[PDB]
A paper describes a structure:
α-Helical barrels (αHBs) are a subset of CCs in which five or more α-helices assemble to generate central solvent-accessible channels along the superhelical axis. Here, we target new assemblies, namely, A3B3 heterohexamer α-helical barrels. These designs are based on pairs of sequences with three heptad repeats (abcdefg), programmed with a = Leu, d = Ile, e = Ala, and g = Ser, and b = c = Glu to make the acidic (A) chains and b = c = Lys in the basic (B) chains. Thus, we set out to design a heterohexameric, A3B3-type αHB, for which the individual helices were unfolded in solution and coassembled when mixed.
Peptides starting at g (g-register) form a parallel 6-helix barrel in solution and in an X-ray crystal structure, whereas the b- and c-register peptides form an antiparallel complex. AUC showed that both CC-Hex2-AB-3-b and -g assemble into monodisperse hexamers. Concentration-dependent CD experiments confirmed A3:B3 stoichiometry, and both bound DPH with low μM affinities. CC-Hex2-AB-3-g showed reduced fluorescence when the substituted amino acids were positioned at the same terminus (N- + N-), suggesting an assembly with a parallel helix orientation. The 1.9 Å resolution structure revealed a parallel heterohexameric coiled-coil barrel with alternating A and B chains, which is completely consistent with the solution-phase data. Indeed, these were near-superposable with the X-ray crystal structure of CC-Hex2-AB-3-g (Cα-RMSD = 0.52 Å). Moreover, at 5.6 Å, the Z-shift for the -g peptide is a whole α-helical turn (5.4 Å). Reasoning that larger Z-shifts lead to larger helical overhangs and less helix–helix contacts in the assembled CCs, it stands to reason that the antiparallel arrangement for the g-register peptide would be the least stable of these and less stable than the observed parallel structure. One of these, CC-Hex2-AB-3-g, has all-parallel helices, as is confirmed by solution-phase spectroscopic data and an X-ray peptide crystal structure. Similarly, while CC-Hex2-AB-3-g forms a parallel A3B3 αHB, the antiparallel tetramer, ap-CC-Tet, also has a g-register but with bar-magnet charge patterning to drive the antiparallel state.
Numbering used by the authors:
A (entry chain I), B (entry chain K), F (entry chain H), G (entry chain F), H (entry chain B), K (entry chain A), ...: 1 to 23
C (entry chain L), D (entry chain G), E (entry chain J), I (entry chain D), J (entry chain E): 1 to 22
The structure:
C-alpha cells in the first residue's frame, strides 16, 4: 500500500540526492 | 487519506530530484 | 493531526523543489 | 510523540526550501 | 524504534537545510 | 517492513545533505 | 484510506462493547 | 499492505462483536 | 485526524472492558 | 516490522471472536 | 501523541482481558 | 517505541481471547 510506495520513493530520493551531493 | 497524499508528494519530490541529478 | 500536517508540509516541499528544478 | 517531532522537522524543512527557492 | 529513528534523521536533515538556506 | 526501509533511506538522505551543506 | 476505515470499525466496536458492558 | 489487512480484520471483529452484543 | 479518533475509541473500549472485567 | 505483527495478531483475534460469537 | 495513547489503551485492554480469562 | 508496545499488547489480547474462546 501507501507505506510501500513511500519507501520506494525514498529509496529513489536517496540515490538521486547522493548523486547530487557527489557532483 | 494523509498517507496517500504523502506518497503522492514523495513521488513528485523524487521526480524533481531525479531531473536535477540527471541534468 | 500530525499526519495531515506532515502531508501539508510535504506538499509545500514538493512545490519548492519543483521551483528549484525549474 | 514521534509523529509530532516529524511534523515539526518537516515544517522547518519546508521553510528552509522556501527560502532557498526564493 | 523506526519512527524515532525517522524523527532523528529528519531533525538532522532540517539542520543541514537550515545551513544551506542560511 | 516499510518503516525500517524508510528509516534506512532517511539516514542516507541525511548524510547526503550534510555533505552538501558542509561542502 | 485504511486509517479512516480503522477508525470507523473502532467506533462500532466501542458501541458494541458499551452495550455489552451495560447488559 | 499491513494497514489494509488491519482494516479488514477490524471490520470482521466489529461484525462478530455486534453479533455477540445482539445475542 | 483519524489517529486521534482511533485513540479516542480505544480509550472508550478500555473503559467498557474494565467495567466488564469488574 | 511491527505493523506485520499487529496484522497477524488481529487475524488471530478475529478468528477467536468468530468462535466466541458462534 | 496519539500512538502513545493508543499503546496505553491497549495495555489497559490486555490487562482487563487477562482478568476476564482468569475465570 | 509505541508501535512495538502496541504489537506486544495485541499479542497478549489474542492469547486471552483464545483462552476465553476455549474456556
Amino acid at each position: 500500500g501507501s507505506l510501500e510506495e513511500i519507501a520506494k520513493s525514498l529509496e529513489e530520493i536517496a540515490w538521486s540526492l547522493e548523486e547530487i551531493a557527489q557532483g | 487519506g494523509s498517507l496517500k497524499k504523502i506518497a503522492k508528494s514523495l513521488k513528485k519530490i523524487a521526480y524533481s530530484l531525479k531531473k536535477i541529478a540527471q541534468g
